[PDB]
Symmetry: D2
Subunit: 215 residues, 4 copies
């Protein structure tokens, strides 16, 4: 009603409201943030950092697919050129991508993209399959974050930065709108060997279920 006009109007009064308050208008990035296209609170706000200090990639279900030229080159640029020492993979609750990933309907091109979430499901299927169906999505969102960190750590870019003695740590969090909190999923890597132990330990922890959701 028209929605583009409202956006332009909101943009204008925003900028004018900022300039009224100070002189709000260089800064080098310190984290690479890999997040989900359908999350709704932004990283810069959620993490309450200075603007400019997050380098941000957002795709559906916040994935690091082994062969995705988009994300890979972003990671390569962050690490090799911008020399960012932290990559963070942030999932979130009530994630549309994960939901689209689990529902059977073919949605078209995007299903192909989401097939990597489905392999992950079937990888931890024994775990997810003894979980009551209505809770699966919440666990898959967590395990997804664990697997993408592991994926990131296995990329040739990251392994090589570790091999040549460059400082680089990988993190995997889930943002929960329900309390505003970032929650650690336990996979934290500064090396190939921290990657393996941390990931394995993380899946082991996730695999212990609340009695009220089992068979």
């Amino acid at each position: 009603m028209d929605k583009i006009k409202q956006l332009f109007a909101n943009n204008y009064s925003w900028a004018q409201r900022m300039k009224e308050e100070n002189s709000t208008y260089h800064q080098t990035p310190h984290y690479l943030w890999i997040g989900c296209s359908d999350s709704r609170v932004p990283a810069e706000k959620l993490t309450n950092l200075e603007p400019g200090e997050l380098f941000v990639h957002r795709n559906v279900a916040n994935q690091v697919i082994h062969t995705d030229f988009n994300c890979l080159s972003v990671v390569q640029y962050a690490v090799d050129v911008l020399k960012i020492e932290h990559i963070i993979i942030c999932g979130h609750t009530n994630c549309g991508g994960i939901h689209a990933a689990m529902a059977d309907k073919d949605l078209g091109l995007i299903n192909n993209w989401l097939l990597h979430i489905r392999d992950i499901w079937f990888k931890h299927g024994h775990l997810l399959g003894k979980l009551s169906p209505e809770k699966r999505a919440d666990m898959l969102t967590k395990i997804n974050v664990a697997e993408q960190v592991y994926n990131l750590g296995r990329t040739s870019i990251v392994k090589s930065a570790w091999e040549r003695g460059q400082k680089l740590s990988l993190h995997g969090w889930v943002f929960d709108v329900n309390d505003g909190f970032l929650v650690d999923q336990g996979v934290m890597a500064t090396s190939r060997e921290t990657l393996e132990i941390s990931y394995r330990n993380a899946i082991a922890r996730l695999s212990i279920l609340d009695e009220e959701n089992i068979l």
Copy 2:
């Protein structure tokens, strides 16, 4: 010093400061936003919209590469499934990607990604080549936004949504940190034929240079 701890600390007091102020913690998206990984003001703030109403993809130099599975499937999901009626490609000033695109140094994997900005440069090389070198980056950022809108409009996904009578409009803006304003680059498509005219008209307008920067 440690930077991860500060982030967690900032996250906590943020969430606690929001809950103090109200009960800040469903909403369907209305725009697909395609933006740049190194821009620093977020879309949700910049456009001052309700959270949840932007579906956001961010990659380096805000590109829609014909064959990028990541962005394409995002666009396909937005249009075919979420039924978003507006895709916005937002570039910005002092864009690192464009700068990396123009500097000669091989930066590695990312140069391959940026080669599409370089083809664009050489496509409008006659224009950019009669511009004083120190201004080129600013024009290339604008022309880039024009070309990516055109790319979006030529994807099979968009053409098909137009063919079956679905409402879909494409926009191409540049965010200017220097005044907070979103500036229209002139390419605005609701159909294949609006795409062509609008794009052509846009390049023609961009090609008229300020006398003080020519030969």
Copy 3:
């Protein structure tokens, strides 16, 4: 160089001395062309070859070929063909960091992990060949799970998926037993194939 000028001579002399019905997804290592080992007439084969004959879910290149094959060319048979002594499969199994190609091969390594119990009670020298077969059945399964092939079946189109390995050692193709003409047949034969591969003969056991 000489090599190149030799190439042209060889072609020039070869010239003087002288629609498709299948999509063939074979491997870039393989040494015997599909057209030769199948003895098919020139033009029957519409061919894609990549490293380790892969159908990666999100690879635009291969997915494009499949879509073009099925929706436009109206091909009714897609054959995925692995082979023995596959340098890709061997590369994927080494610890060595090879750069960009490693990221491509990580998909194979995920396969290795997926059937790691099976491969773990196998003899070291025989693992590459098992993984080569497992790989074939998995790419067929991957093909059958594309939106493209699923829409084709859904809409009633006659389409059949095949997974074969070509053994250099003797020139014979061997069907790996995952063969789909629908989504339900895909499930059944994929699972059957893995179950068949899981039953091990004494002189493959560690």
Copy 4:
């Protein structure tokens, strides 16, 4: 079906009746294998075939093959080979919406636009062939602009890029004249090739 059971028979009878030095980036339409038209010994060719023999800047599949070829296999020659009657090039030139494959072919269409003045003073029936040649020179140029090939040259590695078209009509390969052994030679021969193609003979003129 019968077709398939026929395929195996043909292979079984063909069997009874019976490191690589080049990377070959050819097209999935082409009907004559590289190994045949070059008369090379089996295993000399390490092969990638996609639609319209493309080296798209950001295609992981093809870029992976090149990296593996150059950095690991240590191949010193990459040949890009277009051909006449290329169904991909024809597909790219039609107005018809073919689905996913169109997005793949948009890279060719960008090429068509790029040399649109040249193609615009050409006769309609002869355009596909001009675009096929232009396409070859452009993919070679694309290959020479990858970080992979540029690092290889930079670091002193012996690597040569080639761009040929194979004409079905008579079996002869014809060099398109863009041949690079370095970044500076790439520029010079690419530009030379386009300039050569731009000089038009009377019976190609509209």
